Amino acid sequence: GSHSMRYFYTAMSRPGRGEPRFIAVGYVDDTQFVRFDSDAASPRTEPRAPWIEQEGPEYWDRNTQIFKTNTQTYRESLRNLRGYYNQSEAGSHIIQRMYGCDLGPDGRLLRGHDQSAYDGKDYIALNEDLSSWTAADTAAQITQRKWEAARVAEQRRAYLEGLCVEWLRRYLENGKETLQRADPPKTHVTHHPVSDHEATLRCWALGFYPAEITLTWQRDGEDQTQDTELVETRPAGDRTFQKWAAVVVPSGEEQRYTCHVQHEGLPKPLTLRWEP
């Protein structure tokens, strides 16, 4: 199937409570495999999936050097952005970065990503060309000019097309039994009367991986988007995910409703009904 790798950096200032915290986590698809936290008693890159544990000491030290250096640079960046927005020394602020590479079903690079935010709003993004930037405002334009002057895009491109893809393919092979395994949802429909003339039908999907899934209700074959309650896909804690979709229907019309489920683990979409 298709696969991606992403790293997620969060740098958070906290005036009066020490230097800004830097935490990095790494993912292949929906599986976290590393972490680094500057607030740890002894900050170091730590494994978070069994298949990364085989990497040697040089790997762990290489990661740790990268994250320790980033910790320091992000503190400078937080100071710089405070200034670009004319902000006080009093408030706590956050820079986030997410970046990585997407591969298609053949293992070839589909595209790269490298996006940053400040206080939860887009700040600067590497364009799909991996060569130019989109800045969200005149503050981010300062960063853009600085990064253009230092030919930063060229560095990001070299990584995204090179080491990013190479290491993702390695992880996919080393973790093939899980990373390249799609677990289909286990499904059922429940029925709960809400009154004498209405009942809730809830369509459940449990135990699936990866998290991407489509769960919908149809009435007489028509999508019921507005009248469907859909919860956010949620982690079970055993690698798998859960989701449900509910609709409130007239008592006696239950058989006019069908739940449709699509998931990578499914050869063909499922259609389910309440089974009294």
Binding site: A24, G26, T69, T73, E76, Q155, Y159, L163
Partner: peptide, 13 residues
Amino acid sequence: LPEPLPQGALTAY
């Protein structure tokens, strides 16, 4: 593997 450090100094925002 995360983005490696550049040959020159890592550029801040």
